[PDB]
Each structure stands twice: as structure tokens, then as C-alpha cells.
Design a protein around this nucleic acid. Structure first.
Ligand SMILES: O=c1ccn([C@@H]2O[C@H](COP(=O)(O)OP(=O)(O)OP(=O)(O)O)[C@@H](O)[C@H]2O)c(=O)[nH]1
Length: 338
RNA sequence: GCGAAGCGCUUCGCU
RNA sequence: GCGAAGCGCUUCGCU
């Protein structure tokens, strides 16, 4: 790794604005939020024609406080008043949805760990994923939402990370990379682990079980000053934290021995979890390693993207060539980061 | 035993 | 469907 020159005050002010701009440019307007709602509304009534009692609910970015323009729509389906063959139900869902003049490219994915019917929504141009009884997903949505409300910099960094993985083309788990949900967990972990914490761990501040998993977490975001020790302690700018995250995952954190675990504050090791051979534990489904599908080719691309991320965000310059219309295209240049 | 392409086949992955 | 990793066969290659 290269030595990094000291941060100037003014290159850091640029880092702060660039991170905040990631939130403003990509957080959704009310019109986009409601377009998603309508999609959930319409599909529910349409599916109810064949499967009465069908309840659809959104989760993921559409509802976890990290809504991101043009993200795919995550939908969880259950049936009110209800050993359900999920493989068969996904194909049943597919057969139903091909009759919808507003949908195209209906595709059932039965063999995935989480089976989904994936399709394209004409009016909105969004891609939609319907899964069945994805109840843990509804709860990690509420949990991320609680983190998103603790401190403004949590959104700023999570948005900046979503922009970054998109440009580096490293955020598609269907092409062997990591999923957005994984990167968000990496951000929240980094903020729980830096000294002093920016966020606490909310499931350490009660046993509520769903699918045999304790889904409890502290969620009254109006009263953490009472119950979180290091509240208000960390004063650092968002641009320092974003460069801090890139350095944290390229210089300090040892992926070979430690699990990225937002559920509890202390170190969780590769050895205890039997996950010896990037390792990320789901906040609730503790048997699910979100890095279990990574190739070592793919881990290298991710590591390479983080390293050039460290370079362009860490080497001060001013100015920037008037070629660029704004700082955004300088920092998030896809060729540079790849 | 090794490389390239084509045509088939299988296994793993995808919220 | 898409991504990855294999196996079959054929054709052409191995100094
Ligand atoms: O490994 C996974 C992946 C996905 N999911 C669940 O599916 C949802 C959709 O997962 P996505 O991969 O679509 O992430 P996203 O665009 O919603 O981005 P984030 O806000 O999640 O960073 C995620 O928000 C998560 O709740 C899991 O529970 N586990």
C-alpha cells in the first residue's frame, strides 16, 4: 500500500460535501416513494385475484432508511390465515404475474437461497423481487432504519458506499460479488468499531424470537442519550469517516480472523463461527454468512476497488481539472476506481 | 498430459 | 434468465 499524504483542511471540506452530496443526489423524492407504494398496492390486489388473502409488504432499501434512486423493489409476500412449498409457490406466482399487462420478463428463481419472482415494471422501469415469508428481512429493515435515525452521518456514509460500490461494479451478489445489504453492514460495523463509536449496537442496549432467532433490538431513537454510554462522543466529519472507512478496510481490519458483526460490539472471530475460509454475519440469521458465495477472484476486485478508493479519496489535490463538470465525477470515476 | 473454439451436459450461486 | 466452476464430444493446435 502507498503512504497517504496528510489531509489538508480544504481537501477534507471537499470530502464532506462529496459524501453529503451522495445522500442528496440519490435519496428518493416523495413521488418515487409513492410510486413504490402504488406498485405494492397494485400487485397485492392483482395477486389476490388468484391467491386471496395475499399480503405484500416492502422491505430493504425501500423502507430501511437508505432508500436509493432506481434501486430494485424488495417485496415480501404472505397469505393471511396461513409446510408451504416455496418452490411451487414461486412458479405459481410467476404464472399469475405473466397475465399482467404492466409487467414483463417474469422470471422465477426457485433454486436461490431466497427464492424470488423477478420482473420488470413498465410504468416505473424498476425491477421487482417478490419473496415468500421473508420475515427476518422485515426485521433487519426496521433495524437498519433505527441505525439510519441515530446520526446523520450514518446515512451519509451508507449512501456514499452505495454510490461507490455501484461505480466499482462490485455490488451484485448474483454475479459473485457482495450485495448492497452486505456493504451497508460493513459501514455500520465500521461506525460501531471506530474509537469513539459513531453508533452503538442496538441489540445490546430481551428475547423476541422469529424463526428461532432473537430479533430484539433497541428502537426508541428518542432515548439513546440515556442508555448509550458514548453518545455524542464522536465529533468527526463525514468525509473523515468515509476516508476512515476505506482505510479501516484496507489497513486495519483483518478479514482472515474477524467476522463483520453488527449484532454485538466485541470481536467475533473466524474460529468460533466455524467460518474459517470476507465474512459478514447477518444481524439476526446468525447461521448466514453474507460472504459465503465470494470467489477469491471476486474478493480481489473488491479489495482492489477499496484500495483505489483509498487513493483518490485520500491523496489531496486542489484544484480539479476543469474537464470535470463537478467534484463528483472526479471522485467516482469508474475507470480510476477500476 | 496441455491450449483454443464450437456443440451438448451437469453442479453451485442470485432477496 | 444471469454469474461462476466443472464434465462430454468434435475440430484444430503441442517438436
Ligand atoms: O444477504 C441478504 C441480502 C438481502 N437481504 C434483505 O433483502 C433486502 C434487499 O437486499 P438488496 O441486496 O436489494 O439491498 P438494497 O438495495 O435493499 O440495499 P440495502 O439498503 O439493503 O443496503 C435487504 O435490505 C435485506 O433486508 C438479507 O436479509 N440478507
Amino acid at each position: 500500500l502507498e503512504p497517504l499524504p496528510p489531509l489538508t483542511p480544504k481537501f477534507l471540506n471537499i470530502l464532506d460535501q462529496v459524501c453529503i452530496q451522495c445522500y442528496k443526489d440519490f435519496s428518493p423524492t416523495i413521488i418515487e416513494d409513492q410510486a413504490r407504494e402504488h406498485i405494492r398496492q397494485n400487485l397485492e390486489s392483482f395477486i389476490r385475484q388468484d391467491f386471496p388473502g395475499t399480503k405484500l409488504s416492502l422491505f430493504g432499501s425501500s423502507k430501511n432508511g437508505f432508500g436509493f434512486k432506481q434501486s430494485d423493489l424488495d417485496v415480501c409476500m404472505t397469505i393471511n390465515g396461513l409446510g408451504l412449498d416455496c418452490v411451487r409457490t414461486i412458479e405459481e406466482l410467476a404464472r399469475v404475474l405473466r397475465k399482467h399487462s404492466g409487467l414483463r420478463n417474469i422470471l422465477p428463481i426457485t433454486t436461490a437461497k431466497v427464492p424470488i419472482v423477478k420482473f420488470f415494471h413498465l410504468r416505473s422501469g424498476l425491477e421487482v423481487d417478490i419473496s415468500l415469508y421473508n420475515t427476518l428481512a422485515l426485521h433487519n429493515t426496521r433495524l437498519l432504519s433505527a441505525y439510519s435515525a441515530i446520526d446523520p452521518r450514518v446515512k451519509y456514509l451508507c449512501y456514499t458506499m452505495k454510490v461507490f460500490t455501484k461505480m466499482c461494479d462490485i455490488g451484485d451478489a448474483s454475479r459473485g460479488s457482495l450485495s448492497s445489504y452486505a456493504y451497508t453492514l460493513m459501514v455500520l460495523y465500521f461506525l460501531q468499531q471506530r474509537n469513539p463509536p459513531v453508533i452503538p449496537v442496538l441489540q445490546e442496549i430481551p428475547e423476541i424470537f422469529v424463526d428461532g432467532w432473537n430479533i430484539y433490538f433497541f428502537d426508541q431513537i428518542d432515548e439513546l442519550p440515556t442508555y448509550w454510554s458514548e453518545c455524542g462522543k464522536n465529533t468527526e466529519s463525514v468525509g473523515q469517516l468515509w476516508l476512515g472507512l476505506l482505510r479501516f478496510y484496507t489497513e486495519e481490519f483483518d478479514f482472515k480472523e474477524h467476522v463483520i458483526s453488527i449484532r454485538r460490539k466485541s470481536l467475533l472471530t473466524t474460529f468460533k463461527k466455524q467460518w474459517t475460509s470476507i465474512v459478514i454475519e447477518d444481524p439476526f440469521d446468525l447461521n448466514h454468512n453474507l460472504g459465503a458465495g465470494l470467489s477469491r477472484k471476486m474478493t480481489n476486485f473488491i479489495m482492489k476497488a477499496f484500495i483505489n478508493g483509498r487513493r483518490v479519496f485520500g491523496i489531496p489535490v486542489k484544484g480539479f481539472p476543469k474537464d470535470y463538470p463537478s467534484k463528483m465525477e472526479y471522485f467516482f470515476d469508474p475507470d480510476v476506481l477500476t
